[PDB]
Nucleic acid binder design. Structure first.
Lengths: 49, 53, 53, 47
DNA sequence: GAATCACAAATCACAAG
DNA sequence: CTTGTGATTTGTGATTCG
DNA sequence: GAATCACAAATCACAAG
DNA sequence: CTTGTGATTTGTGATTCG
């Protein structure tokens, strides 16, 4: 379903890795950040989703 | 950790609802949003893209 | 009002447990901590020091 | 559990300074009391 | 639509007593 | 110490860019 | 959420038939 | 003049870029 977004900070070096890889092999940074976040929450906060 | 001590930030826009969950968890049990982002993304790279670290 | 309009802010200390309650509440529901502290404080002044506002 | 800091409007902060200086007290004291009475008033459940 | 900015909130850590 | 506050970091609506 | 690609389908144009 | 082919031009879903 549709869902709004919220700006957050991430460490520059980690952002770059994702930037280079997504430009190299398709995708965008946001997609990845979302997935990383979800997976972190599934891991540490499984109750919450 | 000289490199890391002067490491700065990029911004990124995540799903609000995923952000809300973190906003409340860190409020309750400490830390903050950026910390969660950093760990979340470090662990993801470590998981799927270890060569890059 | 002139003084509110023009001046900035000033750091202040508070009980951690009371602060925490507001941090959780604002995380869950809308708003931010400062917002609440400024109301708290204004209401304190309008009650115990009415002649100063 | 200790202290946390917060940045309040400087005009309201001034008022408190003047008062705590003139009569007894300190800024933290007022804060603590300001906030405590606010919670009681508006968020009584949270104790 | 993602990506980035710019100014506010929030916290840090030294200063003052 | 405890309290006070300027410096610095973190948060996010606003803006950019195509 | 517009700019710029890419490609095809009109539009052109000259000449042959 | 009428009409087929190839040649610029035009309008467009698709895609790039933030």
């Amino acid at each position: 379903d549709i869902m709004g977004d919220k700006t957050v900070r991430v460490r520059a070096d980690l952002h770059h890795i994702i930037k280079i890889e997504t430009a190299k092999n398709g995708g965008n940074v946001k997609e990845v950040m979302d997935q990383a976040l979800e997976e972190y929450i599934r891991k540490y906060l499984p109750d919450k989703l």
